[PDB]
Copies of this chain bind each other. A is one copy, B any other.
Amino acid sequence: SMPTLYHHPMSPASRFVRLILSEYGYQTELSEEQPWENRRDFLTLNPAGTLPVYVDDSMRALCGATIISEYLDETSGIMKRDRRLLAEDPFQRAEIRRLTEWFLQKMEADVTRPLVRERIFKLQMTPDQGGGAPDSKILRTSRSNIRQHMKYLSWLAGSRPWLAGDRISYGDLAAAAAISVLDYLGEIDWSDAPTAKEWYQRLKSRPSFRPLLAERVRGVTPVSHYADLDF
């Protein structure tokens, strides 16, 4: 029976893993999880409460984007030759990981996690869980950090054929995952960032992206260009 991915639509890490699974042709059951609920069965799988979580028949839960992405390289990626999303060379592997961590950890802390919490999770949450109106001060701080991250992405995109070098990698998927969440929310001004825009257009047009562009969060309407391959 197919494995299960516990995830949330507005989790970049979750989107990143979905991308790797589609690129590599896996079939997966998606199970939407709300970590703030502290669901006991979910915490038994992953006591850290983080997303996503990949579980096959063995019931051995693989916890988080990094662990899952490494596992998928070890058990599939090594076969893929030209289509391998993590290289063989240790320095190239290090660069692909550096970019994955930039977008899923650094930009996530600076911008995406707090912004998603204020704008998405705080709608879905009950008052007791921390639900309520968005905090304007957190929104300011997160937003003030965006323009510098978009400037870096533009630079990477303009200077190499893909973010890590000469082929598509986990680095591109991780950036695209994160950008897709911010873009859903209309938080990116693309008029600033023409080089990043060209790069994002290429990612968002891949078949693996289609389920992300079709996806909708209830009570939050995406920005009008969100699903557009020409935006």
Contacts and interface: CB of A to CB of B under 8 A. Distances in A.
Interface string A34-49: 0000000000000110
Number of copies: 2
Interface residues of A, number: 23
A63 interface: yes
Contacts of A67: 94, 97-98, 101
A70 B93 contact: yes
B66 A101 contact: yes
B94 A60 contact: yes
Contact of A48 (B48, B66, B106): B106
B94 A48 contact: no
Interface of A: 47-48, 58, 60, 62-64, 66-67, 70-71, 74-75, 90-91, 93-94, 97-98, 101-102, 106, 152
Contacts of A60: 91, 94
A208 to B, nearest CB: 23
Given A64-B101, A66-B97, A98-B63, A47 B91 contact: no
A58 B94 CA distance: 13
